[PDB]
Amino acid sequence: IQQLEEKVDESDVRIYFNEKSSGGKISIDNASYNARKLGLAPSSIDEKKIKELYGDNLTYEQYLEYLSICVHDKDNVEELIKMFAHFDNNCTGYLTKSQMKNILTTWGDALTDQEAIDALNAFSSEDNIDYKLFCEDILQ
Amino acid sequence: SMASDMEEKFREAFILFSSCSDHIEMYKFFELMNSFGIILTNDEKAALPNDINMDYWLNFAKKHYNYEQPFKHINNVNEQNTNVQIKIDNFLGIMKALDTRLTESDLNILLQITNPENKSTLNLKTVSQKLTESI
Amino acid sequence: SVEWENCVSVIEAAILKHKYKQKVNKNIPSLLRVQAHIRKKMV
């Protein structure tokens, strides 16, 4: 795919594989770690799609396919804020750290309390979080 | 444990009914507990705090939930009216008669979980079973 | 009948909870993208 070659460093794709491969194959967990190091953002949907095709352990070529489905070109602040907008009861565009922690740890590919509180402290030292800004920061 | 595995669904439901607040309005707390089949006596209601938070709810839920028959109060009417195949119409009549907060559209969601497609005979023991299945 | 009042309280409330659940599920695909980008930022 011409969308993959443009977004990721082709040498770092080969190298990150060598950093984690074993018997000519890489584990899905490691392929997702590599994808994140390359600046992609796989979800459990992307892990389920490649597992149905190839199983737990990926050849180099299977690994290149996995990186192509991890691209997610459509992602912007409008598409990320849908769950925060749902729970914003005062129409202020802010949520407390507790509110975001609960949202991030209850549904979807839930974060742990630590992963969630770390990500939020990394973005701001203040209790009220502009959820539009938070999504801008994690996108860039 | 049955209790620890419920804690996920109890936390989810507090967030949904509080609209992700720290404190839940009392009328919403009554819906929250009723949604898991819990009904208090007026004397137990008098002991509730007015400021209800997630931790209160989680201890309250783990104690008052009926692990074997979550929706006992649906089947406790079966002692009054024994297992009978209420007409899909007669059952809608029983619902709109008793003061209810559920619309005809909400009645369809109830039909969509319980019927599912038989559109003929409905006993209260299936609707309790269907509603436990969708916890 | 208190037994009837009980029975409808629990049915209305259980449908309410289902409606609230099916409306947050509409937003989960979105939330997976937030979680995905957080996991990427923090790798």
Side-chain angles (χ1 to χ4, degrees), chain B residues 16-29:
Chain B
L16 298 170
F17 274 86
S18 73
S19 208
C20 197
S21 308
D22 295 334
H23 291 321
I24 185 173
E25 288 193 64
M26 202 73 24
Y27 81 98
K28 280 290 180 186
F29 187 66

PDB file of all heavy atoms in Angstrom, chain B residues 16-29:
ATOM      1  N   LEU B  16     -23.196   4.991  33.426  1.00  0.00           N
ATOM      2  CA  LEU B  16     -24.369   5.237  32.548  1.00  0.00           C
ATOM      3  C   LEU B  16     -25.492   6.018  33.253  1.00  0.00           C
ATOM      4  O   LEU B  16     -26.049   6.868  32.592  1.00  0.00           O
ATOM      5  CB  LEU B  16     -24.929   3.910  32.043  1.00  0.00           C
ATOM      6  CG  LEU B  16     -23.963   3.095  31.199  1.00  0.00           C
ATOM      7  CD1 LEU B  16     -24.479   1.675  30.934  1.00  0.00           C
ATOM      8  CD2 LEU B  16     -23.686   3.847  29.922  1.00  0.00           C
ATOM      9  N   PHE B  17     -25.841   5.741  34.512  1.00  0.00           N
ATOM     10  CA  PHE B  17     -27.040   6.305  35.190  1.00  0.00           C
ATOM     11  C   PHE B  17     -26.706   7.625  35.877  1.00  0.00           C
ATOM     12  O   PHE B  17     -27.643   8.384  36.161  1.00  0.00           O
ATOM     13  CB  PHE B  17     -27.581   5.336  36.239  1.00  0.00           C
ATOM     14  CG  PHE B  17     -28.538   4.324  35.680  1.00  0.00           C
ATOM     15  CD1 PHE B  17     -28.080   3.150  35.131  1.00  0.00           C
ATOM     16  CD2 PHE B  17     -29.896   4.571  35.680  1.00  0.00           C
ATOM     17  CE1 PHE B  17     -28.966   2.230  34.593  1.00  0.00           C
ATOM     18  CE2 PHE B  17     -30.781   3.645  35.160  1.00  0.00           C
ATOM     19  CZ  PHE B  17     -30.311   2.476  34.610  1.00  0.00           C
ATOM     20  N   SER B  18     -25.431   7.853  36.191  1.00  0.00           N
ATOM     21  CA  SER B  18     -24.950   9.112  36.811  1.00  0.00           C
ATOM     22  C   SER B  18     -24.565  10.122  35.722  1.00  0.00           C
ATOM     23  O   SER B  18     -24.223  11.244  36.071  1.00  0.00           O
ATOM     24  CB  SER B  18     -23.795   8.843  37.745  1.00  0.00           C
ATOM     25  OG  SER B  18     -22.603   8.532  37.050  1.00  0.00           O
ATOM     26  N   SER B  19     -24.597   9.700  34.450  1.00  0.00           N
ATOM     27  CA  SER B  19     -23.962  10.368  33.277  1.00  0.00           C
ATOM     28  C   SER B  19     -22.515  10.732  33.632  1.00  0.00           C
ATOM     29  O   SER B  19     -22.130  11.921  33.570  1.00  0.00           O
ATOM     30  CB  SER B  19     -24.767  11.547  32.799  1.00  0.00           C
ATOM     31  OG  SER B  19     -24.537  11.732  31.421  1.00  0.00           O
ATOM     32  N   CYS B  20     -21.765   9.718  34.045  1.00  0.00           N
ATOM     33  CA  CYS B  20     -20.331   9.828  34.366  1.00  0.00           C
ATOM     34  C   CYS B  20     -20.081  10.948  35.379  1.00  0.00           C
ATOM     35  O   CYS B  20     -19.100  11.651  35.237  1.00  0.00           O
ATOM     36  CB  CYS B  20     -19.553  10.120  33.098  1.00  0.00           C
ATOM     37  SG  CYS B  20     -17.788   9.794  33.275  1.00  0.00           S
ATOM     38  N   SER B  21     -20.881  11.042  36.425  1.00  0.00           N
ATOM     39  CA  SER B  21     -20.604  11.926  37.589  1.00  0.00           C
ATOM     40  C   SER B  21     -20.082  11.146  38.792  1.00  0.00           C
ATOM     41  O   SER B  21     -20.267   9.911  38.832  1.00  0.00           O
ATOM     42  CB  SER B  21     -21.846  12.638  37.949  1.00  0.00           C
ATOM     43  OG  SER B  21     -22.348  13.240  36.782  1.00  0.00           O
ATOM     44  N   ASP B  22     -19.508  11.864  39.754  1.00  0.00           N
ATOM     45  CA  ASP B  22     -18.974  11.279  41.015  1.00  0.00           C
ATOM     46  C   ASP B  22     -20.127  10.867  41.936  1.00  0.00           C
ATOM     47  O   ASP B  22     -19.941   9.887  42.689  1.00  0.00           O
ATOM     48  CB  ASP B  22     -18.037  12.229  41.773  1.00  0.00           C
ATOM     49  CG  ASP B  22     -16.747  12.565  41.033  1.00  0.00           C
ATOM     50  OD1 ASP B  22     -16.297  11.729  40.183  1.00  0.00           O
ATOM     51  OD2 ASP B  22     -16.190  13.664  41.311  1.00  0.00           O
ATOM     52  N   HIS B  23     -21.225  11.619  41.888  1.00  0.00           N
ATOM     53  CA  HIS B  23     -22.420  11.505  42.761  1.00  0.00           C
ATOM     54  C   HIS B  23     -23.630  11.285  41.858  1.00  0.00           C
ATOM     55  O   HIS B  23     -23.630  11.813  40.756  1.00  0.00           O
ATOM     56  CB  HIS B  23     -22.607  12.753  43.633  1.00  0.00           C
ATOM     57  CG  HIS B  23     -21.572  12.935  44.701  1.00  0.00           C
ATOM     58  ND1 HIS B  23     -21.050  11.877  45.437  1.00  0.00           N
ATOM     59  CD2 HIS B  23     -20.997  14.053  45.199  1.00  0.00           C
ATOM     60  CE1 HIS B  23     -20.191  12.335  46.324  1.00  0.00           C
ATOM     61  NE2 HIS B  23     -20.131  13.662  46.186  1.00  0.00           N
ATOM     62  N   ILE B  24     -24.577  10.462  42.287  1.00  0.00           N
ATOM     63  CA  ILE B  24     -25.751  10.057  41.475  1.00  0.00           C
ATOM     64  C   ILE B  24     -26.984  10.577  42.187  1.00  0.00           C
ATOM     65  O   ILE B  24     -27.059  10.392  43.346  1.00  0.00           O
ATOM     66  CB  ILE B  24     -25.773   8.540  41.255  1.00  0.00           C
ATOM     67  CG1 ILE B  24     -26.906   8.150  40.315  1.00  0.00           C
ATOM     68  CG2 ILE B  24     -25.902   7.764  42.547  1.00  0.00           C
ATOM     69  CD1 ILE B  24     -26.902   6.702  39.915  1.00  0.00           C
ATOM     70  N   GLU B  25     -27.871  11.289  41.505  1.00  0.00           N
ATOM     71  CA  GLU B  25     -29.176  11.748  42.048  1.00  0.00           C
ATOM     72  C   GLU B  25     -29.938  10.538  42.589  1.00  0.00           C
ATOM     73  O   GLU B  25     -29.838   9.432  41.984  1.00  0.00           O
ATOM     74  CB  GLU B  25     -30.014  12.375  40.935  1.00  0.00           C
ATOM     75  CG  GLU B  25     -29.516  13.733  40.460  1.00  0.00           C
ATOM     76  CD  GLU B  25     -30.507  14.508  39.587  1.00  0.00           C
ATOM     77  OE1 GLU B  25     -31.596  14.871  40.102  1.00  0.00           O
ATOM     78  OE2 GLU B  25     -30.201  14.751  38.390  1.00  0.00           O
ATOM     79  N   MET B  26     -30.723  10.721  43.645  1.00  0.00           N
ATOM     80  CA  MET B  26     -31.467   9.581  44.231  1.00  0.00           C
ATOM     81  C   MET B  26     -32.427   8.975  43.196  1.00  0.00           C
ATOM     82  O   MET B  26     -32.422   7.727  43.064  1.00  0.00           O
ATOM     83  CB  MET B  26     -32.205   9.960  45.509  1.00  0.00           C
ATOM     84  CG  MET B  26     -32.499   8.749  46.384  1.00  0.00           C
ATOM     85  SD  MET B  26     -31.074   7.976  47.283  1.00  0.00           S
ATOM     86  CE  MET B  26     -29.897   9.325  47.384  1.00  0.00           C
ATOM     87  N   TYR B  27     -33.211   9.745  42.442  1.00  0.00           N
ATOM     88  CA  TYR B  27     -34.218   9.064  41.577  1.00  0.00           C
ATOM     89  C   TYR B  27     -33.466   8.122  40.626  1.00  0.00           C
ATOM     90  O   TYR B  27     -33.981   7.019  40.311  1.00  0.00           O
ATOM     91  CB  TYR B  27     -35.201  10.008  40.880  1.00  0.00           C
ATOM     92  CG  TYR B  27     -34.687  10.662  39.633  1.00  0.00           C
ATOM     93  CD1 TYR B  27     -34.999  10.135  38.386  1.00  0.00           C
ATOM     94  CD2 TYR B  27     -33.889  11.807  39.698  1.00  0.00           C
ATOM     95  CE1 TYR B  27     -34.535  10.745  37.230  1.00  0.00           C
ATOM     96  CE2 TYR B  27     -33.415  12.419  38.549  1.00  0.00           C
ATOM     97  CZ  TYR B  27     -33.755  11.891  37.309  1.00  0.00           C
ATOM     98  OH  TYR B  27     -33.304  12.435  36.136  1.00  0.00           O
ATOM     99  N   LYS B  28     -32.245   8.503  40.249  1.00  0.00           N
ATOM    100  CA  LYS B  28     -31.393   7.724  39.317  1.00  0.00           C
ATOM    101  C   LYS B  28     -30.821   6.493  40.022  1.00  0.00           C
ATOM    102  O   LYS B  28     -30.595   5.451  39.342  1.00  0.00           O
ATOM    103  CB  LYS B  28     -30.301   8.642  38.756  1.00  0.00           C
ATOM    104  CG  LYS B  28     -30.787   9.523  37.616  1.00  0.00           C
ATOM    105  CD  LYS B  28     -31.040   8.668  36.398  1.00  0.00           C
ATOM    106  CE  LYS B  28     -31.542   9.358  35.154  1.00  0.00           C
ATOM    107  NZ  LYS B  28     -31.854   8.303  34.157  1.00  0.00           N
ATOM    108  N   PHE B  29     -30.555   6.607  41.322  1.00  0.00           N
ATOM    109  CA  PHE B  29     -30.059   5.474  42.132  1.00  0.00           C
ATOM    110  C   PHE B  29     -31.175   4.442  42.234  1.00  0.00           C
ATOM    111  O   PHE B  29     -30.877   3.244  42.155  1.00  0.00           O
ATOM    112  CB  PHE B  29     -29.588   5.936  43.504  1.00  0.00           C
ATOM    113  CG  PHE B  29     -28.906   4.875  44.322  1.00  0.00           C
ATOM    114  CD1 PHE B  29     -27.698   4.357  43.921  1.00  0.00           C
ATOM    115  CD2 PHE B  29     -29.471   4.409  45.488  1.00  0.00           C
ATOM    116  CE1 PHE B  29     -27.047   3.415  44.687  1.00  0.00           C
ATOM    117  CE2 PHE B  29     -28.831   3.455  46.249  1.00  0.00           C
ATOM    118  CZ  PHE B  29     -27.622   2.958  45.842  1.00  0.00           C
TER     119      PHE B  29
END
